[PDB]
Amino acid sequence: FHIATIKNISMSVEGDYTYLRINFYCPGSALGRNEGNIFPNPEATFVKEI
DNA sequence: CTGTCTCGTGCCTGGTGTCTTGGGTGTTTTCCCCTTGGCGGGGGTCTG
């Protein structure tokens, strides 16, 4: 995935395990100065979180 | 009939709130430094 696809990332430690979340851009989540970045096909499936 | 104000969504975007960073400024924290901690023979002098 290109770094542009990723919207942000977060990391958490739970003593026994560590969780790393990665959020991409998608319709509805393109908040802020990225609104003008209209996706080429907003009707497709967007992977929003991993 | 009738249409203008209102409730109730979608949509989105722009405006709210706050991490993050830098500077000013007082305060502890170590190290360094200064002050401190047996025997005898004489002599003379004073009191009675």
Which residue approaches B14 most closely, CA to C1'? Answer: A32
CA distance A17 to A5: 26
A11 contact partners, CB below 8 Å, separation of at least 6: A18, A19, A20, A21
What method did the depositors use to determine the structure?
cryo-EM
CA distance A29 to A42: 12
Query: For strand B, which nucleotides have at least one atom less than 7 Å from a protein CB?
Result: 12-15
CA distance A46 to A44: 6
Q: Which token pair is A3?
A: 């770094």
* Structural resolution in Å: 3.1
> A12 CA, B11 C1': separation in Å?
33
Q: How many CA atoms lie within 13 A of A13 on its CB side?
A: 1
Q: Which token pair is A48?
A: 């929003």
Q: What is the DSSP letter of A34?
A: T
CA distance A29 to A45: 13
Residues by CB within 7 A of strand B: list them.
A 27-28, 30-32, 35-36
A49 contact partners, CB below 8 Å, separation of at least 6: A21, A22, A23, A24
CA distance A44 to A12: 30
